[PDB]
Design an enzyme around this catalytic site. Structure first.
Site, PDB file in Angstrom:
ATOM      1  N   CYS A 106      29.042   6.142  77.726  1.00 46.79           N
ATOM      2  CA  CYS A 106      30.216   5.784  78.527  1.00 46.79           C
ATOM      3  C   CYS A 106      31.368   6.727  78.222  1.00 46.79           C
ATOM      4  CB  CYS A 106      30.650   4.322  78.246  1.00 46.79           C
ATOM      5  SG  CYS A 106      32.210   3.863  79.085  1.00 46.79           S
ATOM      6  N   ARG A 109      35.470   5.209  77.398  1.00 49.65           N
ATOM      7  CA  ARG A 109      35.647   4.343  76.237  1.00 49.65           C
ATOM      8  C   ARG A 109      37.025   4.372  75.594  1.00 49.65           C
ATOM      9  NH1 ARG A 109      31.054   5.804  72.345  1.00 49.65           N
ATOM     10  NH2 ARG A 109      30.808   7.624  73.742  1.00 49.65           N
ATOM     11  N   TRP A 278      36.282   0.553  86.182  1.00 49.78           N
ATOM     12  CA  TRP A 278      36.555   1.172  87.481  1.00 49.78           C
ATOM     13  C   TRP A 278      35.826   2.516  87.554  1.00 49.78           C
ATOM     14  CZ3 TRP A 278      40.623   0.038  84.018  1.00 49.78           C
ATOM     15  CH2 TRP A 278      40.999   1.115  83.198  1.00 49.78           C
ATOM     16  N   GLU A 283      30.639   9.475  90.348  1.00 53.82           N
ATOM     17  CA  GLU A 283      29.601   8.452  90.441  1.00 53.82           C
ATOM     18  C   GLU A 283      29.237   8.191  91.896  1.00 53.82           C
ATOM     19  OE1 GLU A 283      29.765   5.175  87.409  1.00 53.82           O
ATOM     20  OE2 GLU A 283      31.926   5.664  87.432  1.00 53.82           O
TER      21      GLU A 283
HETATM   22  C1  HEM Z   1      37.212   1.119  82.682  1.00 57.46           C
HETATM   23  C2  HEM Z   1      36.806   2.324  83.118  1.00 57.46           C
HETATM   24  C3  HEM Z   1      35.369   2.871  82.896  1.00 57.46           C
HETATM   25  C4  HEM Z   1      34.954   4.094  83.258  1.00 57.46           C
HETATM   26  C5  HEM Z   1      35.823   5.155  83.953  1.00 57.46           C
HETATM   27  C6  HEM Z   1      33.557   4.240  82.904  1.00 57.46           C
HETATM   28  C7  HEM Z   1      32.760   5.355  83.105  1.00 57.46           C
HETATM   29  C8  HEM Z   1      31.389   5.403  82.931  1.00 57.46           C
HETATM   30  C9  HEM Z   1      30.450   6.367  83.498  1.00 57.46           C
HETATM   31  C10 HEM Z   1      30.792   7.559  84.428  1.00 57.46           C
HETATM   32  C11 HEM Z   1      29.227   6.046  83.068  1.00 57.46           C
HETATM   33  C12 HEM Z   1      27.928   6.766  83.453  1.00 57.46           C
HETATM   34  C13 HEM Z   1      27.335   5.735  84.419  1.00 57.46           C
HETATM   35  C14 HEM Z   1      26.253   6.339  85.248  1.00 57.46           C
HETATM   36  O1  HEM Z   1      26.265   7.600  85.411  1.00 57.46           O
HETATM   37  O2  HEM Z   1      25.398   5.544  85.732  1.00 57.46           O
HETATM   38  C15 HEM Z   1      29.320   4.862  82.230  1.00 57.46           C
HETATM   39  C16 HEM Z   1      28.287   4.209  81.580  1.00 57.46           C
HETATM   40  C17 HEM Z   1      28.362   3.087  80.769  1.00 57.46           C
HETATM   41  N1  HEM Z   1      29.480   2.283  80.531  1.00 57.46           N
HETATM   42 FE1  HEM Z   1      31.431   2.890  81.054  1.00 57.46          FE
HETATM   43  N2  HEM Z   1      33.164   3.067  82.283  1.00 57.46           N
HETATM   44  C18 HEM Z   1      34.242   2.188  82.274  1.00 57.46           C
HETATM   45  C19 HEM Z   1      34.224   0.888  81.769  1.00 57.46           C
HETATM   46  C20 HEM Z   1      33.243   0.292  81.000  1.00 57.46           C
HETATM   47  C21 HEM Z   1      33.251  -1.061  80.451  1.00 57.46           C
HETATM   48  C22 HEM Z   1      34.386  -2.100  80.653  1.00 57.46           C
HETATM   49  C23 HEM Z   1      32.103  -1.223  79.762  1.00 57.46           C
HETATM   50  C24 HEM Z   1      31.617  -2.455  78.961  1.00 57.46           C
HETATM   51  C25 HEM Z   1      32.399  -3.489  78.609  1.00 57.46           C
HETATM   52  C26 HEM Z   1      31.332   0.016  79.852  1.00 57.46           C
HETATM   53  C27 HEM Z   1      30.105   0.266  79.264  1.00 57.46           C
HETATM   54  C28 HEM Z   1      29.193   1.226  79.661  1.00 57.46           C
HETATM   55  C29 HEM Z   1      27.793   1.314  79.267  1.00 57.46           C
HETATM   56  C30 HEM Z   1      26.957   0.419  78.321  1.00 57.46           C
HETATM   57  C31 HEM Z   1      27.268   2.552  79.993  1.00 57.46           C
HETATM   58  C32 HEM Z   1      25.831   3.077  79.929  1.00 57.46           C
HETATM   59  C33 HEM Z   1      25.201   2.448  81.164  1.00 57.46           C
HETATM   60  C34 HEM Z   1      23.760   2.825  81.158  1.00 57.46           C
HETATM   61  O3  HEM Z   1      23.300   3.324  80.097  1.00 57.46           O
HETATM   62  O4  HEM Z   1      23.095   2.617  82.204  1.00 57.46           O
HETATM   63  N3  HEM Z   1      32.062   0.913  80.615  1.00 57.46           N
HETATM   64  N4  HEM Z   1      30.654   4.515  82.167  1.00 57.46           N
HETATM   65  C1  LIG Z   2      30.949  -0.158  83.349  1.00 60.50           C
HETATM   66  C2  LIG Z   2      30.783   0.988  84.309  1.00 60.50           C
HETATM   67  C3  LIG Z   2      31.889   1.687  84.775  1.00 60.50           C
HETATM   68  C4  LIG Z   2      31.697   2.747  85.665  1.00 60.50           C
HETATM   69  N1  LIG Z   2      32.766   3.438  86.143  1.00 60.50           N
HETATM   70  N2  LIG Z   2      30.452   3.083  86.074  1.00 60.50           N
HETATM   71  C5  LIG Z   2      29.355   2.415  85.630  1.00 60.50           C
HETATM   72  C6  LIG Z   2      28.073   2.766  86.067  1.00 60.50           C
HETATM   73  C7  LIG Z   2      26.956   2.071  85.597  1.00 60.50           C
HETATM   74  C8  LIG Z   2      25.584   2.455  86.098  1.00 60.50           C
HETATM   75  N3  LIG Z   2      24.633   2.782  85.033  1.00 60.50           N
HETATM   76  C9  LIG Z   2      23.319   2.910  85.678  1.00 60.50           C
HETATM   77  C10 LIG Z   2      22.489   3.944  84.931  1.00 60.50           C
HETATM   78  C11 LIG Z   2      21.077   3.922  85.452  1.00 60.50           C
HETATM   79  C12 LIG Z   2      20.184   2.964  84.982  1.00 60.50           C
HETATM   80  C13 LIG Z   2      18.881   2.939  85.466  1.00 60.50           C
HETATM   81  C14 LIG Z   2      18.480   3.871  86.421  1.00 60.50           C
HETATM   82  C15 LIG Z   2      17.280   3.850  86.886  1.00 60.50           C
HETATM   83  N4  LIG Z   2      16.207   3.877  87.323  1.00 60.50           N
HETATM   84  C16 LIG Z   2      19.381   4.824  86.888  1.00 60.50           C
HETATM   85  C17 LIG Z   2      20.679   4.853  86.402  1.00 60.50           C
HETATM   86  C18 LIG Z   2      27.117   1.018  84.700  1.00 60.50           C
HETATM   87  C19 LIG Z   2      28.398   0.676  84.271  1.00 60.50           C
HETATM   88  C20 LIG Z   2      29.514   1.356  84.738  1.00 60.50           C
END
Ligand code: HEM
Ligand SMILES: Cc1cc(N)nc2cc(CNCCc3ccc(C#N)cc3)ccc12
Ligand code: HEM
Ligand SMILES: Cc1cc(N)nc2cc(CNCCc3ccc(C#N)cc3)ccc12
Ligand SMILES: C[C@H](O)[C@H](O)[C@H]1CNc2nc(N)[nH]c(=O)c2N1
Ligand SMILES: C[C@H](O)[C@H](O)[C@H]1CNc2nc(N)[nH]c(=O)c2N1
Ligand SMILES: [Zn+2]
Lengths: 407, 411
Positions: A106, A109, A278, A283
């Protein structure tokens, strides 16, 4: 054992000690790096509870205190008695915030400590779950001024009584296959869309149909609910130079909210814990719209721009990709829905890394995921060495419920 | 043990068996991944298994494994080791080794070309002037008036580590960098340290923005000597844009031939500390890294200004928009001047096909995702979506300390 990370754009070197705390395994070995792979009992319980309570109590400067020892005792006796144990509100909140803090993939963070935690552990039914989620969605959306939040449903007991949200995200578009072999809507959700229909949903067979919720309480069979439309804030995508762009008919939802992940805190398992923040613009603009196995709009956009699509070397895909992403940011900013561009987010993440190294001794990070899917090396994170390792509490992936569900 | 990798755009799954051959270490542990870390005198004792492993490979590739020629060659090398404490590769083995070091280079996206490699044997070279001559011929052959040809020139292997041949330049052709009294940098900031050395060694610097550096060459462990590459051998390309006529006024050019000269080639335990090799550029190397890295020529602002973009807010993606036009310009200039170059779409697509072919014919293709994915437009190239496995195979190209930090000066 004390590891150094270097930024090659600034020559800043940080020292990482935090990784020595790491417990879970990476998937890598001394002979092979798996950095680019997407998915690499009572006695088990207590060291986990103990590790967690130690860090919680260290975090509140009562390490080696009676309150600490007492709690350790109390939980210890409850694990002996009940086999499981329950988290106090304080520990719940701490654990949730830290699961985010430790999410090495993420980029957002820097916000980790400003998280609204909704304790839904009193929930018993899918209707209950629906209510809790509607409130989450409304609170987090906040008329477009988004606020990060997580809603936490009862913890796992015996795996036969799991709470599960079947959707991958609270808000997502349906996927319909066509007789002519093509795909209408979101191809990523084709399969889940079937499971909805198989269970009763009446699809409008459209391109941007907001999916219904499929909610599973207490291990029971999952039920369908439609989120009130008035709670689903969406953004019509227009370009601030190209006026033909609106006829492409694109929109996205403002609330990114994952619902299929598993939250682990002190050995306890929360199979249903939807969380939201958000968007970062890419994305949507890069992945959602331009991925080939997704909305795949590059060509049509390039045609409308009248680009030389004869040769790859004209970089037409690159030109279009930028414009699409300009429009996404533009549309969200215009309707006052919170969004962050990849430049601002990665800049913020570097500052967060520096804070975490200074105040925690490091920050686990997956470069493969942190670096945006466009313009990589013109963002600071590209030039930043990172160390990936697994810290607890954590968010983890878990099997899709339909493969597991004893109906 | 079998290892599966998946492409998430095509669902294509591949099985790796080749990683089983990997002996060297990655830097990673079951507890830590160091996949984004840039950088994570040999006894007869430890030399023969390395020779033997290599020769076993070599002879398998020519389908003579366990042949009398195989066995006699093993005996020969063994005797030569225990007699002389090292050994000499046959021309065939040398060529085989050089190609395979390239084949094994997990950070190289251009490996579909690995079998077409012109090898120049410079093991008879004894002096810096001799090195200059060899390097000139390499540059001329490899440049081929713009129709670039991959080549490597191999100088004598290390003996005691006190008679090392080294090319002190990081690349054969590279632009000078000059730090100014006001703190600003004229030329390529990446090369300021090396530039300073050359100047100290007697190089008369023109002090311009694109001065081709002199060669600083070390033979047999002696102090390095300066030489100038005949300018007529240095193919350069003025950068212009197909639509933007002001772009030429930016005053940019680059050299056609990317040739790394500071790496070490290991073959059967033998160390070749001077082994410059060259191919041709992928466009983004110049257009993204060389021009647009903040620590390099850093031209983003000047370019975005001339395009009149909204530079007050990053959400305009003025940087992204400028980056693309520059990369278009670099591709366009090279193609117009008929100098070999490849865009990042073509190259990544070729690499996927190469990679798949390698899994079938070889049981794997070690690859560094962090390096394979281009530095712009990442996910619209097919490699972004490709799972990869990274591991170290020999023969190999390795990093080595900069000679100025280790060299014992004679005078
Ligand atoms: C508030 C603004 C936030 C932004 C701008 C943001 C941004 C991102 C981005 C760009 C990714 C990559 C997601 C993808 O490519 O599918 C991601 C993944 C992730 N985020 Fe953040 N996020 C935010 C909030 C949060 C919050 C509130 C949480 C948890 C309480 C969180 C937990 C995670 C986790 C666990 C992943 C990995 C997801 C996965 O492995 O599929 N994020 N985030
Ligand atoms: C909190 C959060 C914030 C944010 N801005 N974007 C966020 C996007 C995600 C999306 N992660 C999805 C990652 C994934 C998982 C499985 C497969 C498959 N097959 C392909 C992609 C989750 C949380 C988010
Ligand atoms: C012929 C066309 C070629 C192309 C298009 C190509 C492309 C590339 C690119 C883009 C990189 C990344 C370098 C960077 O970002 O700094 C790279 C790295 C590398 N290439 Fe190739 N290459 C080619 C030929 C060769 C040849 C002939 C060899 C060796 C005989 C080679 C061996 C390597 C090695 C060892 C690296 C890693 C460099 C390092 O780790 O510092 N390549 N290549
Ligand atoms: C054969 C080859 C071909 C080609 N097209 N491009 C090629 C580029 C390279 C360039 N490798 C540079 C690796 C590096 C390492 C450290 C630092 C620092 N500080 C900066 C750069 C080498 C060989 C190439
Ligand atoms: C193969 C590779 O691991 C895969 O495509 C990854 C690459 N980096 C990513 N980065 C982010 N933020 N999200 C992703 O889904 C992926 N996918
Ligand atoms: C810290 C990070 O590993 C570093 O910036 C790497 C990333 N990937 C790269 N990829 C290529 N092709 N070339 C590079 O110089 C780098 N630099
Ligand atoms: Zn690793």
């Amino acid at each position: 054992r004390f590891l150094k990370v270097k930024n090659w754009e600034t020559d800043v070197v940080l020292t990482d000690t935090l990784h020595l705390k790491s417990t879970l395994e990476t998937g890598c070995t001394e002979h092979i790096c798996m950095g680019s792979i997407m998915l690499p009992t009572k006695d088990q319980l207590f060291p986990l509870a103990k590790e967690f309570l130690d860090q919680y109590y260290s975090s509140i400067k009562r390490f080696g205190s009676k309150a600490h020892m007492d709690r350790l005792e109390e939980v210890n006796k409850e694990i002996e008695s009940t086999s499981t144990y329950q988290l106090k509100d304080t520990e719940l909140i701490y654990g949730a915030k830290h699961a985010w803090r430790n999410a090495s993939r993420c980029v957002g963070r820097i916000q980790w400590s400003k998280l609204q935690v909704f304790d839904a552990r009193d929930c018993t039914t899918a209707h209950g779950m629906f209510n809790y989620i509607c409130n989450h969605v409304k609170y987090a959306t906040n008329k477009g001024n988004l606020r990060s939040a997580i809603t936490i449903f009862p913890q796992r007991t015996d795996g036969k009584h799991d709470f599960r949200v079947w959707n991958s995200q609270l808000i997502r578009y349906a996927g319909y296959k066509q007789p002519d072999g093509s795909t209408l809507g979101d191809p990523a959700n084709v399969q889940f869309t079937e499971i909805c229909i198989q269970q009763g949903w009446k699809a409008p067979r459209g391109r941007f149909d907001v999916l219904p919720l499929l909610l599973q309480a207490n291990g029971n069979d999952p039920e369908l609910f439609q989120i009130p439309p008035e709670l689903v804030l969406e953004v019509p995508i227009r370009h601030p130079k190209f006026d033909w762009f609106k006829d492409l008919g694109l929109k996205w939802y403002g609330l990114p909210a994952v619902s299929n992940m598993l939250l682990e805190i002190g050995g306890l398992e929360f199979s249903a814990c939807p969380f939201s923040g958000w968007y970062m613009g890419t994305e949507i603009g890069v992945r959602d719209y331009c991925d080939n196995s997704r909305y795949n709009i590059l060509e049509e956009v390039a045609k409308k721009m009248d680009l030389d699509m004869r040769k790859t070397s004209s970089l037409w895909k690159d030109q279009a990709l930028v414009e699409i992403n300009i429009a996404v940011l533009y549309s969200f900013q215009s309707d006052k829905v919170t969004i962050v561009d990849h430049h601002s987010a990665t800049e913020s993440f570097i500052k967060h890394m520096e804070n975490e190294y200074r105040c925690r001794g490091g920050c686990p990070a997956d470069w493969v995921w942190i670096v945006p899917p466009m313009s990589g090396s013109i963002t600071p994170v590209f030039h930043q060495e990172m160390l990936n390792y697994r810290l607890t509490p954590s968010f983890e992936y878990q099997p899709d419920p339909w493969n597991t569900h004893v109906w």
